[PDB]
């Protein structure tokens, strides 16, 4: 679930709704999968797609990822306006996709940010090291002893996969390897991302209960509506948070 098939499809149907209504396109969080969206997708009365981060995705920058996701999206719906959402890391990518579409043009795209905005050797190790800790129970200092002395990113990814496998032999090595590696690149991409223009279109922030607009005022002119959703950073897309999100999506559209 914190893993994606690195040879899987980038664009995927999260529901099978058959309708002439414009699809909702949903951008993965940092983990890269669309698993988080399953409940939302199963409850929407609109065709919904998920974008997952695979080996095809250019993770050199948010710019390149956004342009690639736009490319995928066009194979389903050639022309905008588009209905795009992003959850947490995905909010930043969704923003850049809409910024790029705006630049390509008076645009009427719909943008929903689910608890995220244009956020966020040693940094390399702390990234892979944090990665290992999410897959194992291994104490911080023992992971850091295996990784810090190593001499590049690829040596650390390989050691990370080894350490995770020792704890969980049934995880695919190719998936673990892609996930460790891409995680570093996703962080790097984010760290180097700088919106180059104010977004004019309308943005809706849906931030979890547990500034107010996540600094969307410095990057966007148009009606930034902020709704607060019951739950924490994870649970706003399940249960009571979810049901309220669907209602807000259903009336905005
Ligand atoms: C959204 O997806 C984020 C953001 C949460 C806060 C909302 C503000 C937008 C969420 O997944 C949190 C987290 C971010 C990773 C932080 C650790 C970075 C390490 C610092 C080193 C940087 C040096 C380059 O995601 C996670 O904690 C885990 C994701 C990975 C892929 C396992 N989730 C674990 O369950």
From Swiss-Prot:
The modification N6-acetyllysine is found at residue 151. There is a cross-link at residue 209 (Glycyl lysine isopeptide (Lys-Gly) (interchain with G-Cter in SUMO2)). It is found in: Cytoplasm; Melanosome. Residues 1-253 are annotated as: Thioesterase. The active site is at 88 (for thioesterase activity), 233 (for thioesterase activity). Ubiquitous. Prominent expression in brain, lung, liver and mammary gland. In adipocytes, S-nitrosylation of Fatty acid synthase occurs under physiological conditions and gradually increases during adipogenesis. Disulfide bonds: none annotated. The modification Phosphoserine is found at residue 16. The relatively low beta-ketoacyl synthase activity may be attributable to the low 4'-phosphopantetheine content of the protein. Homodimer which is arranged in a head to tail fashion. Interacts with CEACAM1; this interaction is insulin and phosphorylation-dependent; reduces fatty-acid synthase activity. Fatty acid synthetase is a multifunctional enzyme that catalyzes the de novo biosynthesis of long-chain saturated fatty acids starting from acetyl-CoA and malonyl-CoA in the presence of NADPH. This multifunctional protein contains 7 catalytic activities and a site for the binding of the prosthetic group 4'-phosphopantetheine of the acyl carrier protein ([ACP]) domain. This is Fatty acid synthase. It comes from Homo sapiens (Human). The chain holds residues 2221 to 2501 of 2511 of the full protein.
């Amino acid at each position: 679930s914190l893993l994606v098939n690195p040879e899987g499809p980038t664009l995927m149907r999260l529901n099978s709704v058959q309708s002439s209504e414009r699809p909702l396109f949903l951008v993965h969080p940092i983990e890269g999968s669309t698993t988080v969206f399953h409940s939302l997708a199963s409850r929407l009365s609109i065709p919904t797609y998920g974008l997952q981060c695979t080996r095809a995705a250019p993770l050199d920058s948010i710019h390149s990822l956004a342009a690639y996701y736009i490319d995928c999206i066009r194979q389903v719906q050639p022309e905008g306006p588009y209905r795009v959402a992003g959850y947490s890391y995905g909010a930043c990518v969704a923003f850049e996709m809409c910024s790029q579409l705006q630049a390509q043009q008076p645009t009427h795209n719909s943008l929903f940010l689910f608890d995220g905005s244009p956020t966020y050797a040693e940094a390399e190790t702390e990234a892979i090291c944090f990665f290992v800790q999410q897959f194992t129970d291994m104490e911080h200092n023992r992971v850091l002893e295996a990784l810090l002395p190593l001499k590049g990113l690829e040596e650390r990814v390989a050691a990370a996969v080894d350490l995770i496998i020792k704890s969980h032999q049934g995880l695919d090595r190719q998936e673990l390897s892609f996930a460790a590696r891409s995680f570093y690149y996703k962080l790097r991409a984010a760290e180097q991302y700088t919106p180059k223009a104010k977004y004019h279109g309308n943005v809706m922030l849906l931030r979890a209960k547990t500034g107010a607009d996540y600094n969307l005022s410095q990057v966007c002119d148009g009606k930034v509506s902020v709704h607060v959703i019951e739950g924490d950073h994870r649970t706003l897309l399940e249960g009571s948070g979810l049901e309220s999100i669907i209602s807000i999506i259903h009336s905005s559209l």
